[PDB]
Design a protein around this nucleic acid. Structure first.
Ligand SMILES: [Mg+2]
Ligand SMILES: [Mg+2]
Ligand SMILES: [Mg+2]
Ligand SMILES: [Mg+2]
Ligand SMILES: [Mg+2]
Ligand SMILES: [Mg+2]
Ligand SMILES: [Mg+2]
Ligand SMILES: [Mg+2]
Ligand SMILES: [Mg+2]
Ligand SMILES: [Mg+2]
Ligand SMILES: [Mg+2]
Ligand SMILES: [Mg+2]
Ligand SMILES: [Mg+2]
Ligand SMILES: [Mg+2]
Ligand SMILES: [Mg+2]
Ligand SMILES: [Mg+2]
Ligand SMILES: [Mg+2]
Ligand SMILES: [Mg+2]
Ligand SMILES: [Mg+2]
Ligand SMILES: [Mg+2]
Ligand SMILES: [Mg+2]
Ligand SMILES: [Mg+2]
Ligand SMILES: [Mg+2]
Ligand SMILES: [Mg+2]
Ligand SMILES: [Mg+2]
Ligand SMILES: [Mg+2]
Ligand SMILES: [Mg+2]
Ligand SMILES: [Mg+2]
Ligand SMILES: [Mg+2]
Ligand SMILES: [Mg+2]
Ligand SMILES: [Mg+2]
Ligand SMILES: [Mg+2]
Ligand SMILES: [Mg+2]
Ligand SMILES: [Mg+2]
Ligand SMILES: [Mg+2]
Ligand SMILES: [Mg+2]
Ligand SMILES: [Mg+2]
Ligand SMILES: [Mg+2]
Ligand SMILES: [Mg+2]
Ligand SMILES: [Mg+2]
Ligand SMILES: [Mg+2]
Ligand SMILES: [Mg+2]
Ligand SMILES: [Mg+2]
Ligand SMILES: [Mg+2]
Ligand SMILES: [Mg+2]
Ligand SMILES: [Mg+2]
Ligand SMILES: [Mg+2]
Ligand SMILES: [Mg+2]
Ligand SMILES: [Mg+2]
Ligand SMILES: [Mg+2]
Ligand SMILES: [Mg+2]
Ligand SMILES: [Mg+2]
Ligand SMILES: [Mg+2]
Ligand SMILES: [Mg+2]
Ligand SMILES: [Mg+2]
Ligand SMILES: [Mg+2]
Ligand SMILES: [Mg+2]
Ligand SMILES: [Mg+2]
Ligand SMILES: [Mg+2]
Ligand SMILES: [Mg+2]
Ligand SMILES: [Mg+2]
Ligand SMILES: [Mg+2]
Ligand SMILES: [Mg+2]
Ligand SMILES: [Mg+2]
Ligand SMILES: [Mg+2]
Ligand SMILES: [Mg+2]
Ligand SMILES: [Mg+2]
Ligand SMILES: [Mg+2]
Ligand SMILES: [Mg+2]
Ligand SMILES: [Mg+2]
Ligand SMILES: [Mg+2]
Ligand SMILES: [Mg+2]
Ligand SMILES: [Mg+2]
Ligand SMILES: [Mg+2]
Ligand SMILES: [Mg+2]
Ligand SMILES: [Mg+2]
Ligand SMILES: [Mg+2]
Ligand SMILES: [Mg+2]
Ligand SMILES: [Mg+2]
Ligand SMILES: [Mg+2]
Ligand SMILES: [Mg+2]
Ligand SMILES: [Mg+2]
Ligand SMILES: [Mg+2]
Ligand SMILES: [Mg+2]
Ligand SMILES: [Mg+2]
Ligand SMILES: [Mg+2]
Ligand SMILES: [Mg+2]
Ligand SMILES: [Mg+2]
Ligand SMILES: [Mg+2]
Ligand SMILES: [Mg+2]
Ligand SMILES: [Mg+2]
Ligand SMILES: [Mg+2]
Ligand SMILES: [Mg+2]
Ligand SMILES: [Mg+2]
Ligand SMILES: [Mg+2]
Ligand SMILES: [Mg+2]
Ligand SMILES: [Mg+2]
Ligand SMILES: [Mg+2]
Ligand SMILES: [Mg+2]
Ligand SMILES: [Mg+2]
Ligand SMILES: [Mg+2]
Ligand SMILES: [Mg+2]
Ligand SMILES: [Mg+2]
Ligand SMILES: [Mg+2]
Ligand SMILES: [Mg+2]
Ligand SMILES: [Mg+2]
Ligand SMILES: [Mg+2]
Ligand SMILES: [Mg+2]
Ligand SMILES: [Mg+2]
Ligand SMILES: [Mg+2]
Ligand SMILES: [Mg+2]
Ligand SMILES: [Mg+2]
Ligand SMILES: [Mg+2]
Ligand SMILES: [Mg+2]
Ligand SMILES: [Mg+2]
Ligand SMILES: [Mg+2]
Ligand SMILES: [Mg+2]
Ligand SMILES: [Mg+2]
Ligand SMILES: [Mg+2]
Ligand SMILES: [Mg+2]
Ligand SMILES: [Mg+2]
Ligand SMILES: [Mg+2]
Ligand SMILES: [Mg+2]
Ligand SMILES: [Mg+2]
Ligand SMILES: [Mg+2]
Ligand SMILES: [Mg+2]
Ligand SMILES: [Mg+2]
Ligand SMILES: [Mg+2]
Ligand SMILES: [Mg+2]
Ligand SMILES: [Mg+2]
Ligand SMILES: [Mg+2]
Ligand SMILES: [Mg+2]
Ligand SMILES: [Mg+2]
Ligand SMILES: [Mg+2]
Ligand SMILES: [Mg+2]
Ligand SMILES: [Mg+2]
Ligand SMILES: [Mg+2]
Ligand SMILES: [Mg+2]
Ligand SMILES: [Mg+2]
Ligand SMILES: [Mg+2]
Ligand SMILES: [Mg+2]
Ligand SMILES: [Mg+2]
Ligand SMILES: [Mg+2]
Ligand SMILES: [Mg+2]
Lengths: 59, 49, 113, 118
RNA sequence: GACCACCCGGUGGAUGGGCCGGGGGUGUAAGCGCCGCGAGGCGUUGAGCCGACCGGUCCCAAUCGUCCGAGGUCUUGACC
RNA sequence: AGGGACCCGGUGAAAUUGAACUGGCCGUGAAGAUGCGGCCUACCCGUGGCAGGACGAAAAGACCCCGUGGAGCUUUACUGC
RNA sequence: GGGGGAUGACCCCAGGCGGUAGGGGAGCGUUCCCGAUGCCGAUGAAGGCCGACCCGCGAGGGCGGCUGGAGGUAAGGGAAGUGCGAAUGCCGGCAUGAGUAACGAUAAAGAGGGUGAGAAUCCCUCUCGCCGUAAGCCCAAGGGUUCCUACGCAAUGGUCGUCAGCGUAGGGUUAGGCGGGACCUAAGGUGAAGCCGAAAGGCGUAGCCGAAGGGCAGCCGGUUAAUAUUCCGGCCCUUCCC
RNA sequence: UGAGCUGGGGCUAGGAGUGAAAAGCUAACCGAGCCCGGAGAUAGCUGGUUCUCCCCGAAAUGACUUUAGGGUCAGCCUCAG
RNA sequence: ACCGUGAGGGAAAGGUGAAAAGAACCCCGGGAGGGGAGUGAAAUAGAGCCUGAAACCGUGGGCUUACAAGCAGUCACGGCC
RNA sequence: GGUCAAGAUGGUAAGGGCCCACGGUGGAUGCCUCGGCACCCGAGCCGAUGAAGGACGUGGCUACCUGCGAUAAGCCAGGGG
């Protein structure tokens, strides 16, 4: 409001191009060891999906 | 910091009250105008019975 | 056949949720689900609901077989604006607008043999 | 810049950071399983390991030591008698940190699992 | 090193955390014994405690995995 | 050292804004040019930063003058009370 | 301008035709009136959306398709709230900056369990921190259901909410002794008498009004989700009438 | 401990009050409060002034002007006769 | 309504359809919302409801663009649809 | 079948631009109106028998409006229908 301020309205072409880097990257996902579903790597696969580790059960 | 509005019900009726308005001919017109504008309240509503 | 579900007047900014919608466009339903579950956005929840409501319209209303439907089309349009006052320094009052989206997932069966 | 200097600051000052760990240690060594933020975990390993490895020593010094951070007369008991044994032949690695695939919401924080090994 | 990028590792692995050893800092821990009415003092005692630095060691954690990615436009020129 | 600044999730303003596809030099031009001439340089789009320029924003210059504009004050200005 | 006598509107002919302030002359379109007891219209009015078509120098007029769903209005004349791009114009709508600053004290948080479609944010437990002449408690102002409980989460809450001072509903405020009034007077106000002023009105002795001052009889416990010196229990007083 | 501070109840105001005096204060702007009215005050000043085509097409000088960035007459444009 | 102690200031906000026939029931969903069914001459007349313009924001398609430089148009040729 | 020096040319869009189609937003345009405006008639006072204007109440369930007043969506009588 005070000291600086924009001098001209930015074109639709110019905000849209600023946003050319705003796209998301879809999650990284692997199929679980033995349980059915898809899970993110290096994590406790939400349907119990660990052997030598615990799992907090879905069971 | 202490502001302009420091409510005090006695003061409010002592000052803009109906009986106060009726004393002064100046006040009798205030009623007359408000009553003719069709104001729903002729006078600041005050309470604390 | 193709089937669609529309969540309207969803109290979220179009530009915000549009971001995850673009994440499922053209994809299998199977994949799309797996994407929304782990997409870390408030818009996931909503888009999830619209998608699942769309499938539940293909199978029960249009006969489409859940195992063959992809996200043929999807988009979100700008619902009406919730103008609210934001009190500011030196007695200003701005108006922030809580935005609103119209989510439209539209499903079709994959052209598989 | 500030290279090395091992030791996360967890947007806390000195005293808060201490009582963070302590209050997280008690909480661990009472349920033996903990869910926290991934970083609050990573940093919580060594703090407890040192505590256990000290209760393997059995001596009252080791006890009197530990008491500084856990302050409670039991638990230390439960530490020395019920937990400290199980690691006798186990040198280091008394603790395990597993990552949960679920995040919070209205926060978005990645979470992790902290439990006692074996 | 702001995020990104860059670099090293990812079990056929010493990458970090732990544990051990060394360095380093602090400067004689608790407990017990002796002397003193006592505050304290002495011995055990360079003890005890110990962040990063130098290393060691699979005890814990880098499991298991998915995804992208060429088959090579044309003419000529010399050689097959 | 801590609270911000940076990254992630949630919420999400503001002045400003002719339109923009908005470079440097030497000239030129209403005399201080991204926008005209000549030359030089320069793939497209961002993020964190600095503040030289857009005669940057703000406030229809408070100084100055103009107006047979206005107001406060003065006196042996005029004329009243 | 001159002929063409065509007096028409028509032809050849020759000239003029940059243009601000301004002068003049022709027209286009908008609303309303006569034309209207008419005509167009559900086989689709007005308005909208296209058009590479037709006529007009242009302002415009047609025509065709889609939309639309009940009006419209010729030739020809009449009358005007009659054409917008600017007035830091007015009202409204929507952009830009921008996913940027910010999310309101640096007293500070951690885990476990519970509810729930959904929990960093609600409930309980343990741990940790902050006030402690307060950041605790009780009165007076002021506010006026915000109190207690049940059911709720669209909005309000600077995030989230299953919570709330929010939404719906139901309940809850008990006095001869506490405060105020059927008592007193203070400044001041009002004001028979009285005095003054063009009118409105201004003064003014007593009187009257006027209080957080004078005067006046209740202490300790118990109970309700929500009231208690108010209800209850025990001890104790006041005034009025007979 | 004082020309102290403070609650409650009161009085004084617009050319008027109040002021240990700054033209300070009199409801967040006081060299003369606020509201409504006279009022559409006045503004020789700034800004704005909306469809089309056709012809002609200027002045920025003179004289007077409490006049000089405004006017009256003449000059120069235009229309009818 | 709201603003103002007060005098006083002072708004915005009309239209489903001939008729509620205002969408039983089923599916997704905690709800909102939608998809079917159904009503209707018409449901982009479904109650944030006649007509529904513009700014503005999206989805899809044709042409185009990463060694060029500019009041963004125009005049040429050329490719592609 | 390839290799090879020189040279010559495609596709590719992170994103952007123009066009087209369909929506979202928004509520202009058209039509509608029993609200307003204007003139012309008519008509013209009410109040201590307590006016005007109100406060509070009043319904089997009633937030507001309207009506009414503890006889309270109303009581009695005449006339209309
Ligand atoms: Mg500055
Ligand atoms: Mg674009
Ligand atoms: Mg004070
Ligand atoms: Mg105020
Ligand atoms: Mg009082
Ligand atoms: Mg009178
Ligand atoms: Mg009323
Ligand atoms: Mg303020
Ligand atoms: Mg932070
Ligand atoms: Mg401290
Ligand atoms: Mg890193
Ligand atoms: Mg690697
Ligand atoms: Mg591997
Ligand atoms: Mg290592
Ligand atoms: Mg050592
Ligand atoms: Mg010693
Ligand atoms: Mg010792
Ligand atoms: Mg002794
Ligand atoms: Mg720092
Ligand atoms: Mg953010
Ligand atoms: Mg020059
Ligand atoms: Mg220059
Ligand atoms: Mg140019
Ligand atoms: Mg040029
Ligand atoms: Mg240049
Ligand atoms: Mg040139
Ligand atoms: Mg750039
Ligand atoms: Mg930058
Ligand atoms: Mg600068
Ligand atoms: Mg700066
Ligand atoms: Mg000026
Ligand atoms: Mg002057
Ligand atoms: Mg003057
Ligand atoms: Mg003729
Ligand atoms: Mg000619
Ligand atoms: Mg010429
Ligand atoms: Mg001309
Ligand atoms: Mg003429
Ligand atoms: Mg006309
Ligand atoms: Mg007619
Ligand atoms: Mg029909
Ligand atoms: Mg039609
Ligand atoms: Mg009409
Ligand atoms: Mg036309
Ligand atoms: Mg039409
Ligand atoms: Mg007509
Ligand atoms: Mg006509
Ligand atoms: Mg007009
Ligand atoms: Mg006109
Ligand atoms: Mg103009
Ligand atoms: Mg404008
Ligand atoms: Mg400007
Ligand atoms: Mg609106
Ligand atoms: Mg910025
Ligand atoms: Mg920033
Ligand atoms: Mg920030
Ligand atoms: Mg806060
Ligand atoms: Mg804070
Ligand atoms: Mg739980
Ligand atoms: Mg449960
Ligand atoms: Mg919890
Ligand atoms: Mg917690
Ligand atoms: Mg908190
Ligand atoms: Mg009270
Ligand atoms: Mg309430
Ligand atoms: Mg409550
Ligand atoms: Mg509740
Ligand atoms: Mg809510
Ligand atoms: Mg919220
Ligand atoms: Mg707030
Ligand atoms: Mg919520
Ligand atoms: Mg409530
Ligand atoms: Mg009693
Ligand atoms: Mg009391
Ligand atoms: Mg009393
Ligand atoms: Mg009395
Ligand atoms: Mg009595
Ligand atoms: Mg008295
Ligand atoms: Mg008097
Ligand atoms: Mg009198
Ligand atoms: Mg008199
Ligand atoms: Mg008293
Ligand atoms: Mg008293
Ligand atoms: Mg008493
Ligand atoms: Mg007593
Ligand atoms: Mg209570
Ligand atoms: Mg009691
Ligand atoms: Mg009693
Ligand atoms: Mg004194
Ligand atoms: Mg006082
Ligand atoms: Mg007072
Ligand atoms: Mg005055
Ligand atoms: Mg006056
Ligand atoms: Mg004075
Ligand atoms: Mg003073
Ligand atoms: Mg003031
Ligand atoms: Mg006048
Ligand atoms: Mg004016
Ligand atoms: Mg004047
Ligand atoms: Mg004027
Ligand atoms: Mg002419
Ligand atoms: Mg000429
Ligand atoms: Mg003169
Ligand atoms: Mg002159
Ligand atoms: Mg002048
Ligand atoms: Mg003249
Ligand atoms: Mg002449
Ligand atoms: Mg002539
Ligand atoms: Mg107010
Ligand atoms: Mg008020
Ligand atoms: Mg208005
Ligand atoms: Mg409407
Ligand atoms: Mg109708
Ligand atoms: Mg109707
Ligand atoms: Mg279900
Ligand atoms: Mg729920
Ligand atoms: Mg439906
Ligand atoms: Mg039908
Ligand atoms: Mg239709
Ligand atoms: Mg039709
Ligand atoms: Mg439908
Ligand atoms: Mg249908
Ligand atoms: Mg339609
Ligand atoms: Mg329709
Ligand atoms: Mg609408
Ligand atoms: Mg409609
Ligand atoms: Mg209709
Ligand atoms: Mg519509
Ligand atoms: Mg549109
Ligand atoms: Mg596109
Ligand atoms: Mg080059
Ligand atoms: Mg190129
Ligand atoms: Mg450029
Ligand atoms: Mg160009
Ligand atoms: Mg492209
Ligand atoms: Mg549309
Ligand atoms: Mg009428
Ligand atoms: Mg009487
Ligand atoms: Mg009498
Ligand atoms: Mg009455
Ligand atoms: Mg009523
Ligand atoms: Mg009757
Ligand atoms: Mg009868
Ligand atoms: Mg009869």
């Amino acid at each position: 409001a005070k000291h600086p301020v924009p001098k001209k309205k930015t074109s639709k072409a110019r905000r849209d191009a600023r946003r050319s880097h705003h796209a998301l990257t879809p999650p990284t996902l692997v199929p679980c060891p033995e349980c059915k579903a898809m899970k993110p790597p290096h994590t406790v696969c939400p349907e119990c999906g660990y052997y030598a580790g615990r799992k907090v059960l879905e069971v | 910091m202490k502001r302009t509005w420091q409510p005090n019900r006695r003061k409010r009726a002592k000052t803009h009250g109906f009986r106060a308005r009726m004393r002064t001919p100046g006040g009798r017109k205030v009623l007359k105008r408000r009553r003719q504008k069709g104001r729903w309240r002729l006078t600041p509503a005050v309470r604390k019975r | 056949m193709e089937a669609k579900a529309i969540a309207r007047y969803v109290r979220i900014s179009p530009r915000k949720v549009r971001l995850v919608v673009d994440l499922i466009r053209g994809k299998s339903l199977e994949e799309a689900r797996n994407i929304l579950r782990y997409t870390n956005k408030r818009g996931a929840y909503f888009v999830a609901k619209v998608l699942e409501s769309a499938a539940a319209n293909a199978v029960n209303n249009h006969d489409m077989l859940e195992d063959r439907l992809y996200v043929k089309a999807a988009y979100v349009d700008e619902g009406p604006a919730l103008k609210r006052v934001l009190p500011r320094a030196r007695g200003r009052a701005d108006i922030i607008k809580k935005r609103t989206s119209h989510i439209t997932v539209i499903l079709g069966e994959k052209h598989g043999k | 810049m500030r290279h090395l200097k091992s030791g996360r600051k967890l947007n806390r000052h000195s005293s808060h950071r201490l009582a963070l760990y302590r209050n997280q240690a008690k909480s661990l060594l009472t349920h033996g399983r903990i869910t926290t933020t991934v970083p609050k975990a990573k940093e919580l390993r060594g703090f407890v390991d040192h505590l256990i490895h000290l209760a393997k020593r059995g001596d009252l010094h080791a006890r009197r030591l530990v008491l500084r951070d856990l302050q409670d007369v039991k638990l230390v008991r439960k530490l020395f008698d019920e937990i400290a044994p199980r690691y006798r032949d186990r040198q280091g690695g008394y603790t395990r940190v597993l990552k949960l695939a679920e995040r919070r919401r209205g926060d978005g924080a990645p979470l992790a699992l902290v439990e006692l090994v074996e």
